[PDB]
């Protein structure tokens, strides 16, 4: 289930995404890994807005942690290298109080800004690096720089 989407990661298999959805809607912790990763993995770069709405709409009411984590990565992977439309989701995830969904959004801005040397996201990303309280979204915050610095890799060891 976890590698299912990583195998079909570039093909964008809507068919496997279908059964992966109902796999994700079991309201359980054992199936959370079953669907939570491959669901977005088979929709890498797909930008399926219904997929975003499914993942974020389901990671608001759960009770377990893995079902929060697989969605935390799937939502960060559903948008791939846009840098111009993922901003609303980056703000929506960073403004949250969820100690995992912020960190989920912290990973997101990295993938929405894959190596993006934009000094715009560096302000508030590397700002919540400062004022951030949760250690999880803090470490995920500082760990987006190299994911946003292939344009000038010599700058990471200076900041």
């Amino acid at each position: 289930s976890l590698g299912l989407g990583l195998a079909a990661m570039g093909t964008a298999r809507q068919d496997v995404y279908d059964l992966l959805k109902t796999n994700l809607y079991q309201d359980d912790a054992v199936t959370g890994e079953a669907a939570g990763l491959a669901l977005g993995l088979v929709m890498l770069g797909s930008k399926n807005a219904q997929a975003i709405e499914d993942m974020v709409g389901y990671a608001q009411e759960t009770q377990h942690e893995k079902i929060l984590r697989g969605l935390a990565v799937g939502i960060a992977l559903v948008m791939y290298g846009r840098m111009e439309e993922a901003d609303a989701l980056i703000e929506s995830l960073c403004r949250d109080k969820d100690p995992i969904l912020r960190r989920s959004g912290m990973y997101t801005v990295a993938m929405a800004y894959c190596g993006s040397g934009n000094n715009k996201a560096i302000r508030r990303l590397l700002h919540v690096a400062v004022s951030d309280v949760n250690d999880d979204v803090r470490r995920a915050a500082v760990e987006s720089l190299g994911f946003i610095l292939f344009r000038t890799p010599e700058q990471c060891p200076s900041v």
Binding site: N119, H127, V159
Partner: protein
């Protein structure tokens, strides 16, 4: 180089300024 001098100094401006705001952030947080 000379045009890339003028571009690279520009790039050395804002990326340097974000650190300026950054130390402000760090100091204010450290007070807390």
């Amino acid at each position: 180089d000379l045009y890339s001098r003028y571009k690279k100094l520009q790039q050395e401006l804002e990326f340097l300024e974000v650190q300026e705001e950054y130390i402000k952030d760090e100091q204010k947080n450290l007070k807390k």
